[PDB]
Amino acid sequence: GFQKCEQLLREYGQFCSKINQALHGANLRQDDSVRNLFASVKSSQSSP
Amino acid sequence: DDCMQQGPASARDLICAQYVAGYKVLPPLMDVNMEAAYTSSLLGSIAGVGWTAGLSSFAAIPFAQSIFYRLNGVGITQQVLSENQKLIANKFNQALG
Amino acid sequence: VGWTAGLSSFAAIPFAQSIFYRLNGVGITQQVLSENQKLIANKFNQALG
Amino acid sequence: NECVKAQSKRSGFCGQGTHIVSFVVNAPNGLYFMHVGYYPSNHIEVVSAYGLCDAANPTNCIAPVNGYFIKTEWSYTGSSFYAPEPITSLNTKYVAPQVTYQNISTNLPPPLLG
Amino acid sequence: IQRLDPPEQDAQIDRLINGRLTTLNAFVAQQLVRSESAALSAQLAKDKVNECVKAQSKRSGFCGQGTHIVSFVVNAPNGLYFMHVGYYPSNHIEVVS
Amino acid sequence: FSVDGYIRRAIDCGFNDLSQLHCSYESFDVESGVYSVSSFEAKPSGSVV
Amino acid sequence: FNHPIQVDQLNSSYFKLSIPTNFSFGVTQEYIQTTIQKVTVDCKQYVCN
Ligand SMILES: *[C@@H]1O[C@H](CO)[C@@H](O[C@@H]2O[C@H](CO)[C@@H](O[C@@H]3O[C@H](CO)[C@@H](O)[C@H](O[C@H]4O[C@H](CO)[C@@H](O)[C@H](O)[C@@H]4O)[C@@H]3O)[C@H](O)[C@H]2NC(C)=O)[C@H](O)[C@H]1NC(C)=O
Ligand SMILES: *[C@@H]1O[C@H](CO)[C@@H](O)[C@H](O)[C@H]1NC(C)=O
Ligand SMILES: *[C@@H]1O[C@H](CO)[C@@H](O)[C@H](O)[C@H]1NC(C)=O
Numbered sequence A: 001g002f003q004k005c006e007q008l009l010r011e012y013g014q015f016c017s018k019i020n021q022a023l024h025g026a027n028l029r030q031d032d033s034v035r036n037l038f039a040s041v042k043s044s045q046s047s048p
Numbered sequence B: 001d002d003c004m005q006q007g008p009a010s011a012r013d014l015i016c017a018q019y020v021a022g023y024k025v026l027p028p029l030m031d032v033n034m035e036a037a038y039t040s041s042l043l044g045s046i047a048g049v050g051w052t053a054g055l056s057s058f059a060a061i062p063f064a065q066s067i068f069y070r071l072n073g074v075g076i077t078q079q080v081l082s083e084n085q086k087l088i089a090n091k092f093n094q095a096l097g
Numbered sequence C: 001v002g003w004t005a006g007l008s009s010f011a012a013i014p015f016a017q018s019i020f021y022r023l024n025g026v027g028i029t030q031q032v033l034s035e036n037q038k039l040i041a042n043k044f045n046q047a048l049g
Numbered sequence D: 001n002e003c004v005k006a007q008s009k010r011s012g013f014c015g016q017g018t019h020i021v022s023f024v025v026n027a028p029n030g031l032y033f034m035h036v037g038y039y040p041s042n043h044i045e046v047v048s049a050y051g052l053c054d055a056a057n058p059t060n061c062i063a064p065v066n067g068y069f070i071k072t073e074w075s076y077t078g079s080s081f082y083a084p085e086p087i088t089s090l091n092t093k094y095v096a097p098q099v100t101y102q103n104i105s106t107n108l109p110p111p112l113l114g
Numbered sequence E: 001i002q003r004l005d006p007p008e009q010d011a012q013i014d015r016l017i018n019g020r021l022t023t024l025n026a027f028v029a030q031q032l033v034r035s036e037s038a039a040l041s042a043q044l045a046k047d048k049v050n051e052c053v054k055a056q057s058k059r060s061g062f063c064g065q066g067t068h069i070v071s072f073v074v075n076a077p078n079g080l081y082f083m084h085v086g087y088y089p090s091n092h093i094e095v096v097s
Numbered sequence F: 001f002s003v004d005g006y007i008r009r010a011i012d013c014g015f016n017d018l019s020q021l022h023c024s025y026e027s028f029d030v031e032s033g034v035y036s037v038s039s040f041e042a043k044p045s046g047s048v049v
Numbered sequence G: 001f002n003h004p005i006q007v008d009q010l011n012s013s014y015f016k017l018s019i020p021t022n023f024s025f026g027v028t029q030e031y032i033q034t035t036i037q038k039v040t041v042d043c044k045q046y047v048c049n
Helices: A005-013 A015-041 B033-043 B064-073 B076-084 B084-097 C015-024 C032-036 C035-049 E005-055 F015-026 G043-048
Strands: B059-060 D016-029 D030-041 D044-049 D052-054 D059-066 D067-071 D074-078 D079-086 D092-095 D102-104 E067-076 E078-086 G016-017 G023-031
Touching: A005 A015, A005 E005, A015 B033, A015 E005, A015 G016, B033 E067, B064 B076, B064 B084, B064 E067, B076 B084, B084 E078, C015 C035, C015 D016, C032 C035, C032 D079, C035 D030, C035 G023, D059 D067, D067 G016, D079 F015, E005 E078
Parallel strands: D052 D102
Antiparallel strands: B059 G016, D016 D030, D030 G023, D044 D067, D044 G016, D052 D059, D059 D092, D067 D074, D074 D079, E067 E078
16 A cells, blocks of 8 residues: 555556466456366256 | 454464465355255255256156165166165164264 | 278268168167168158258 | 367267267367367157066067167157167167066067067 | 655555565465365266265266265255265185076 | 686587577487477567557 | 256166157257457568558
8 A cells, every 4th residue: 555665566568467467367267167067067967 | 353352372373464465265155055055955855866868857756766776777677676675774873873 | 880890991872771771770670671772851851851 | 189089978068969070170279179079959858778678588678779668568769869769689689687677568679579 | 654764655655565475476476376276166966966865876886885875965055965875795715507 | 618627619609500409408419319499589670559 | 057857766677768749950050169359460570651
């Protein structure tokens, strides 16, 4: 939250955009991994 | 709120650290009951899925009947399986118990 | 290529003939495949179209 | 090798449903697989036997091959598609007798009419 | 900020920035490595359910040890827990064949 | 540098692209292959002010 | 949760068979990446211009 720091941070480019996008993609990857995995465990027919 | 009204559980509490350090742990895609539903339906499909040709039909047969076909399929003859059905069930039960 | 034993010989057979062997191999009987050859080709074509 | 050059018997390896045939085309950074599978629908429930034995000759038993023996007396259907047809030597195999096999005494199929 | 003026204050803040940027880059690099690994692993889990659980496997060592008979699946904290029941021979004898 | 310390052989690392290759691997013998080396720079032909 | 078709077991020497009466073909599409774009960098130029 310090403005002086934020001012200096800006000189490193869109650093935080890169951090957020990299993690966003990495997190989507698990939702996709899970969705695919369960779609395959799922039975068509099953007994109670 | 738990981390404010109770505070950290112990030294190096990485869950309460989230609101301090600036990071967040996100919830998983499926809740527990849904994941349980998937493996529960899977359990009930085993005897009738690994039975014959194709993946399209389901044989609602007893688990035990499935085991005997599985044992026959690996080289144990039917005369043996028939004489030993209780012995086989007991050994299976010991393995899981 | 996906026709018989070994990877060494090639059966130059019609695609359609291959499909019917593939369907027979998964549990659809020959009486069914014979009665429905046009129905099967149409469904296949819908799937790809 | 598994999908395209062969019909696969591995559930879920290729596509969903029962694998029939796959095709491959190139894609910008790799291959694009086109897996054609067989998707069943409108399932019905029928009553099936584990096998059939000659009631008069209890050691002479059959089991279905890649299909089922269903009530309709007994007839055969392929495993992926309900379509009853007569039980013949081409859709059966002889097996050792089992407690779960039915004892049939009337309309015995040709493999048991011995 | 409280102790130093801008020409030196800047240098000190900048050290903290470099260290924290480095930390975040390392973190992200590992989340990408760990998520790639977990994704490959998830496909292995997919294959085991289809090969192991929904089918009897004939592949030695793919499922469990010994000859595979039946497998079960339950959920685990970060994945699946496979329960592979195999047939284990003992007391071998030699005969002439 | 020889065992006795004298320089008997050398590469001028800016002479050509092949020389750049040898220098980047710090060796007079590099394996066969296709390698990227420093680009051929465009140089100013004048100035505008 | 999308429940599977429930097929009951029987208290008998028989069993219930849930068997298709109809079918369709469908296509599962899959992309597998085999390559990445190959890139080289003139590091000396990149850093110092
Ligand atoms: C179609 O006909 C068959 C053939 O008759 C019939 O299956 C037979 O059923 C009888 C019982 O009705 C089985 O006989 C016994 O059943 C008891 C049940 O607990 C077993 O405990 C006995 O085992 C002891 O005795 C055996 C004698 O050799 C020993 O070998 C064994 O180790 C035990 O000491 C015994 O099994 C009979 O075995 C089966 N036959 C077969 C081939 O399994 C069948 O049920 C009829 N079909 C239908 C749907 O009714
Ligand atoms: C019906 O199920 C019960 C469950 O215990 C079993 O004891 C009984 O023998 C079964 N009857 C038949 C015909 O299998
Ligand atoms: C199979 O499903 C299709 C879907 O529209 C339908 O048109 C066709 O008549 C169905 N066939 C049977 C035998 O029900």
